[PDB]
Amino acid sequence: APKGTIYLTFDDGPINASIDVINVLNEQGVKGTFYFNAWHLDGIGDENEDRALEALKLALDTGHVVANHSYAHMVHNCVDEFGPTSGAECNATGDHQINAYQDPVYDASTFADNLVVFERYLPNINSYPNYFGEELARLPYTNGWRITKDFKADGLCATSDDLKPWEPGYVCDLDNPSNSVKASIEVQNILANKGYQTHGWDVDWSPENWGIPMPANSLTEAEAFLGYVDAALNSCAPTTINPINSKAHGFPCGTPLHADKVVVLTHEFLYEDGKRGMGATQNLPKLAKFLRIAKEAGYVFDTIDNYTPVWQVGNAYAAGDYVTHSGTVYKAVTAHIAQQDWAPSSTSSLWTNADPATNWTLNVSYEAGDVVTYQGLRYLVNVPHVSQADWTPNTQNTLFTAL
């Protein structure tokens, strides 16, 4: 038996430093989840990205999961007209989390255009089992969560309308949050309706002190960081974390799917000797040590696509157990042994659809007070039922009422 499961996640690649992080993981057989922005493939990301596409292939060919972090990390929302140099301009002012989300519908279509750009550089990318770019996402700067119908969170302080949190006068206020944070929540609901899950994080391997001249140099030591991981296990880390920017407000603490797991967040550019410090010189052995000793401490590493386990012939499932089957979440209705001829489906009596989306869907267990969207209209659930073809919201005056 294992102590728990760590999910190593790496934001904001593929950059030339993705290559070196991958080789450290590959030396120890650990596989990681990589949330990628494809503008590094167009070389407009203002980093070292000569080998970005080489990095993307190395990740896929050595079995790491690739996931959708949007095309340009919402840098169009920081400049006034997004173009080649926008990545460089926005690094001058450092106004990244300021007005990070504005038009939710445009911002969300940035995840769509991400996929179009990947498939253009790696035209055979859909043939990799590891490519989850259509199904797994993470919002820039936001500790947001869309996991199941009953497992969602939101980062209510992750972005700002005016000031940075280290500037005098920054007041957060979860009761009326920033228009940027409001926009970020709409983006998640849009992605959820497209069939995505989104994962935030339990722990952040990041600078303890971003203000420092070389902020990559202040990365937590591995031994100490194993301490933050042991700290975070079953302790509902996303609400207790610091700063209040990276908090996941509304995290369903105690939820069963999160038990015995820790999602670690890091950035590849923290592992590069360069503009942010001695990243490779100081932190690549940090990461190597963390794998050796976290294994010793009793952990097993995995990738986010298994956080929600895949339905498997031969496993015993209990009522209320969550699985994934074709990138769609289901909750067991009936304890049973899963056999090949009754996998989850839109008509299974053994399973109900539990995707965190909000359009009306077949085989969902609706509670009263739920709202669904159907043929462009919003209906409210008057009576708890499991939906089926005959009960479309626009024909069942009893079950649904139009808003």
Ligand SMILES: CC(=O)N[C@@H]1[C@@H](O)[C@H](O[C@@H]2O[C@H](CO)[C@@H](O[C@@H]3O[C@H](CO)[C@@H](O)[C@H](O)[C@H]3NC(C)=O)[C@H](O)[C@H]2N)[C@@H](CO)O[C@H]1O
């Ligand atoms: C500690 C704190 O006050 N806030 C934490 C955030 O720092 C952090 O979110 C991360 O912020 C980074 C700084 O903005 C940001 O890096 C930027 O990313 C873009 C895209 O790669 C680059 O163009 C910028 O150069 C880069 N900025 C810098 C200074 O390197 C990260 O993308 C973003 N995730 C989160 C997670 O650590 O936690 C907050 O609490």
Ligand SMILES: [Zn+2]
């Ligand atoms: Zn990011």
